[model samples]
Target: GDQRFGDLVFRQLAPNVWQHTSFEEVNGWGVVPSNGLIVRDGGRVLVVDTAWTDDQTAQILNWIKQEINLPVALAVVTHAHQDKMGGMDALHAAGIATYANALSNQLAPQEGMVAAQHSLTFAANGWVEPATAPNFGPLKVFYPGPGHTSDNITVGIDGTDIAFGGCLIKDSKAKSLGNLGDADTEHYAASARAFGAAFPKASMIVMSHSAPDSRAAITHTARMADKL
Candidate 1:
């Protein structure tokens, strides 16, 4: 279940699916960590989330090419937050396409961030989101309203029974809503509820800054959200 490529440590959580954690410093947050996902489909791979820096991302890409030995078909940013998209430039430089919700694209720049080279801009403008079918590696982008951020979304991998909950959801040890600079705390509970209802069958769950677990992560997050 453990694989290391350069400085990236990948933990295989399911068949052809793995998770990686990377760390970076955020203003006021200081040395925060973020998680990324990899899903192998066919001869290509689907990447959800990127490393914390372009350098780290390059290392990750190197591993994918040298170890995984597959072209990355798509990379997805779960939200506008830096932890989700900080390594975007590395992916684009490698000529890999990336996608995110329209809301994320719109807000990222306003957050003084850059948009991905490619994107999933709402309904007709893009081909991802709202979960019609498999757009990339059997993964469906699901936006369960606002939680960590207004544009935060969870990615579900088909047949994998796994949900990458990004920063919107939390690990069991999370005592309170960790960061709220860009959060809508009032409606976060509703968003969490919607996410649980949307993916009741997910056997495994990944939180952005915590270890992977099962349905307990969902319940733990809702409990923290209610107190806030």
Candidate 2:
């Protein structure tokens, strides 16, 4: 069942995972729908990314409290884009502990958003397991060099075959690389390949600008970047 909360829609993708979709208008993309994730485990919840605006993010928090009935113990922002961290204010106001890549925190201010509450640091192409974070479960955050942006990352749930690729992974139907204003064109292909390799078991990849798709979307994105 899909539940509508204001401008956001929450669709259950798995027994314990829900995909939160929100829309925003962009110059070339028209009205674009973006996705984030909500995962519940052991009476606690984890939010993958904030919605595109503070109001929408507040609605998400409300829905979680009224529907899921569990506290959002942690949140991980995949990048510094507006679609990823634009709701940082709402998360902060809710007092939910938020985490983002160190690079993302440095770039977030330029996007008119505040940095996450905590920083998760790793090498450019390396990853960090947030296993120690209470209620994080099997989440793994991987920065696959640079693709959509210099700070793009993919979050995969180990053993669950689910991952949030944010804007770094494109939809299967994407005709071209959507936006390149902040993309690393020279290394996009390599980054996409690294993203695919990092989630070999990922079947349902929740992308920021499109519906969740199989890992084949990762391959499509890599091939598209190859021609750039």
Q: Which residue pairs clash within candidate 1?
A: none
* Model 2 bad stretches (over 4 Å): 129-135
lDDT of 2 by residue, 51-137 (tens): 989998999899999889999888999999888898999998888999988889999889788899888877545776454243567
lDDT of 1 by residue, 1-228 (tens): 777766667888887888877777678767776788988998898899988778888888887887689888888888887678877889888988877777777887786656876556444322244442335658877778778898887888888788878888888777777878788888888888777777779978888888888788888888888877
For model 2, which pairs clash? none
Best by TM-score: 2
Taking all chains together, each candidate's TM-score versus the true structure is: 0.90, 0.95
